[PDB]
């Protein structure tokens, strides 16, 4: 109830999108993103730094990569107060590969200052998927291979080539013996794309198994652009071996590193009784790419080559796509990384909303070399098109951190799930679903520690598109489970003011901490669609018992601040002092305008009304029938003490305030039984400027002698009104009396 509205400080700059993301830095600065500003061609979005002292904003240096094209930098922001950091993401980088474009994300982890170029997240963009595949075969032609099985191996190759030629595939084959035998190149397959025509006339070589040199000639002679291999294609080699290298002058130490520098992915089919021993199977693991379990399988005889070719088709398809078919389920591509961002203590996190056909997912770059990707357990069509990670927030469970996620489109109903880690394994602790279809439940998330325990007591879930007649949004009060394994259950619900059905209450949420000095954390909720998109911000106090008050305390409409404001409350950021006045400030974002609201110190008034002649003494009821006037002394003491309900780093010696006394005697009766010294009626009004020390004033009452017989005691009521004088420094900031302050005081004087 104590946010200064009249002396608000508004920032403005001509850049499309300025106000669409705000974040309070520690050092008296507000960082705002302008995601739609065209600073240069093939770049979009910029960032600005707004200081409280210098009322203008300054641009931020942009170390944008060349293929971070049309980035929309500044759509998502996050910062940490205790280590000075800034996480700025543009989640719309366009990679226009041949025949497809992709939308991805890129972030920047600034530090204490801004000319130091930050840590890029991710350091490497995921990149263009390679186009078309060059598949080579290397088949054993030792004398160990019996002639009937040799034709089984040829039929294996022919059927797999028939199965793998979906479109635009080139194939090659080289037998391998004592000497090595190029039967057909990729170019020769392109001119005659009949696998059986190329494979059937081949005759079996005989002799010693020179596996290592055969791998070398595949890399050199067979994977060569003069023989039809295509640049930037997938290079796959399938080696079919009896698995016992004999007589080869080269070891595996030589040809395998040169196979890896050319990027040749190696599959091994190990055939026969040779690999019933584990030692021979480890030699198969040496040939193939890592991990061996995916790339190595063992068949007991060449007739069992038919068994692996069913699964090997799926395993080789997996590089292009796993169980994809048509209408491919795009995974870690189309992701839009950093769509929602947050900085975990371990490392910066950033959400991939477009992961697994927009089912949603969250990256966790704790060291950036390991990426901890986190979506949910069930893999089904139900989870598709959920946009999970659209609001990402962290909770504190005894100062150990966990994660909460928002999927506003789970079967066109919102969904919010919690995650915690178990010895490096991030599992879904619980989930909460919405009920209003299209309410966008979970578009905004906000974790609230009411008592500042270090234990998050409450997660605020916003459903800004919930339509309930006059109401135009909803915020769900969802406390964290204590640990009785009860499913996560939302105890209460917060609405906005009635009258704006398209008001979007709950589109942006923040924690501003304690503003009124009640030791309980207060929250703000923005409604940037109210009053026909001239938005508003509501303030809700915390409650003892770790809840949020169902009725708001202060509604700040964007119409009253400036006539040319729009979407007031689309971006919120609180919890830090920006004016160095010890007052918890609060920044609000709007279209084209960003404005900060300063918190006013709260005062409370204590009234003590004490009479030394509180005794009735009843002398007056013996009047000697003379002319009756108010007689006898009237000692009165009226002390008022005003104290601070808020702690600030002000000096606190300059807290002046003006209070107005109104006094009434025997109110509620037609004529009173008492009058004052001066007015000669039953009314008194005094004004007096008061500090924070008790100022006490003695008065004189007058009692007429013979009155009605003593039944009712005399009362002295006091109503008052406090206007704090603004401070000479600190931008004329006015102390305000508490909303729940008692403003009536009755005194007792018996009859």
């Amino acid at each position, epitope marked *: 109830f104590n946010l200064d509205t009249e002396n608000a400080m508004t920032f403005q700059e001509n850049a499309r999108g300025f106000g669409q993301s705000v974040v309070q830095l520690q050092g008296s600065r507000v960082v705002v993103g302008a995601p739609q500003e065209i600073v240069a061609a093939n770049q979009r979005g910029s960032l600005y730094q707004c200081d409280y002292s210098t009322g203008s904003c300054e641009p931020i240096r942009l170390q944008v990569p060349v293929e971070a094209v049309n980035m929309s930098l500044g759509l998502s922001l996050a910062a940490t107060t205790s280590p000075p950091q800034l996480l700025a993401c543009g989640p719309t980088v366009h990679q226009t590969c041949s025949e497809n474009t992709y939308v991805k994300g890129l972030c920047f982890l600034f530090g204490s200052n801004l000319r130091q170029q930050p840590q890029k997240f991710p350091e490497a963009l995921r990149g263009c998927p390679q186009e078309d595949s060059d598949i080579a075969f290397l088949i054993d032609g030792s004398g160990s291979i019996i002639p009937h099985d040799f034709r089984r191996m040829k039929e294996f190759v022919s059927t797999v080539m028939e199965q793998l030629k979906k479109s635009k595939t080139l194939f090659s084959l080289m037998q391998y*013996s*004592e*000497e*090595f*035998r190029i039967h057909f190149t990729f170019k020769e397959f392109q001119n005659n794309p009949n696998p059986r025509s190329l494979v059937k006339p081949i*005759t*079996q070589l*005989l002799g010693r198994t020179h596996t290592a040199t055969g791998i070398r000639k595949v890399v050199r002679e067979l994977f060569r652009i003069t023989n039809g291999a295509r640049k930037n294609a997938f290079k796959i080699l399938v080696v079919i071996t009896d698995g016992e290298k004999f007589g080869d002058p080269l070891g595996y130490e030589d040809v395998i590193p040169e196979a890896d520098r050319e990027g040749v992915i190696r599959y091994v089919i190990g055939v026969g009784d040779a690999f019933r021993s584990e030692k021979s199977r480890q030699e198969l693991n040496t040939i193939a790419s890592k991990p061996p379990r995916d790339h190595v399988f063992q068949v007991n005889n060449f007739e069992a080559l038919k068994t692996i070719q069913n699964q090997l088709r799926e395993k080789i398809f997996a590089i292009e796509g796993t169980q994809t078919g048509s209408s491919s389920s795009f995974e870690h591509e189309m992701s839009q990384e950093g769509f929602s961002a947050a900085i975990t203590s371990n490392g910066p996190l950033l959400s991939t909303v477009g992961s697994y056909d927009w089912a949603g997912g969250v990256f966790l770059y704790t060291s950036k070399e390991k990426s901890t990707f986190i979506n949910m357990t069930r893999v089904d069509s139900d989870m598709n098109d959920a946009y999970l990670g659209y609001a990402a927030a962290i909770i504190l469970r005894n100062r150990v951190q966990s994660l909460v996620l928002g999927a506003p489109r789970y079967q066109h109903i919102g969904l919010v799930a919690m995650f915690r880690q178990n010895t490096g394994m991030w599992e879904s602790n619980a989930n909460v679903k919405g009920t209003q279809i299209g309410a966008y439940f979970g578009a905004s998330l906000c974790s609230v520690d009411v008592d500042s325990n270090g234990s998050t007591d409450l997660v605020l879930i916003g459903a800004p598109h919930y339509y309930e007649q006059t109401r135009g949004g909803q915020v769900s009060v969802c406390p964290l489970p204590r640990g009785q394994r009860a499913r996560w259950q939302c105890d209460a619900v917060l609405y906005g003011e009635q009258g704006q059905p398209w008001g979007r209450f709950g589109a942006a949420l923040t924690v501003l901490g304690d503003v009124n000095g009640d030791k309980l954390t207060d929250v703000a909720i923005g409604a940037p669609g109210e009053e026909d998109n001239r938005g508003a911000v509501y303030l809700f106090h915390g409650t003892s018992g770790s809840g949020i008050s169902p009725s708001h305390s202060q509604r700040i409409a964007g119409s009253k601040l400036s006539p040319r404001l729009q979407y007031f409350g689309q971006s919120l950021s609180g919890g830090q002092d920006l004016t160095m006045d010890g007052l918890v400030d609060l920044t609000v974002g709007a279209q084209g305008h960003v404005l900060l609201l300063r918190s006013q110190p709260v005062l409370r008034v204590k009234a003590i009304m004490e009479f030394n002649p509180r005794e009735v003494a009843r002398n007056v009821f013996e009047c000697n029938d003379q002319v009756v006037k108010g007689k006898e002394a009237g000692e009165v003491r009226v002390c008022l003490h005003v104290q601070k309900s808020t702690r600030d780093r002000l000096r606190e010696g300059q807290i002046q305030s003006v209070v107005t006394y109104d006094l009434a005697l025997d109110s509620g009766r037609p004529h009173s039984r008492a009058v004052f010294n001066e007015t000669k009626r039953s009314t008194r009004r005094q004004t007096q400027v008061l500090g924070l020390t008790q100022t006490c004033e003695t008065l004189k009452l007058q009692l007429p002698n013979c009155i009605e017989d003593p039944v009712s005691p005399i009362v002295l009521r006091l109503n008052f009104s406090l206007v704090g004088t603004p401070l000479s420094a600190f931008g004329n900031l006015r102390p305000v009396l508490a909303e729940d302050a008692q403003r009536l005081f009755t005194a007792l004087f018996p009859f």
Partner: nanobody
Amino acid sequence: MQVQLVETGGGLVQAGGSLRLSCAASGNINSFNAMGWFRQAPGKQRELVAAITFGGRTNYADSVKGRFTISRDNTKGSVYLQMNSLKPEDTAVYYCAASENNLLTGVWHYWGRGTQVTVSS
């Protein structure tokens, strides 16, 4: 598999002279690997005097070492026998042979019909 062998180069040659034998294989180069030359002198059986693998490893009989050279051109499907310092004891019908497999001493199923080389004293 169908492979046909034809010998080209035989004839009459003086002692101390030289002669080159050649042969093309009528079929798929993928359908045969090892090639060799035999000779059959009068009264005698077919003697392997020079054989070559597909990659060019050679073996020679001791009676022709230092005088005969076997060579091949896989781009033409051909193998050659350059016979230098010819002697009357080299008079024979010379055959070319080819194998489906790549061994120098095994399964010489494909045979040419042979060509006569007669060396006069």
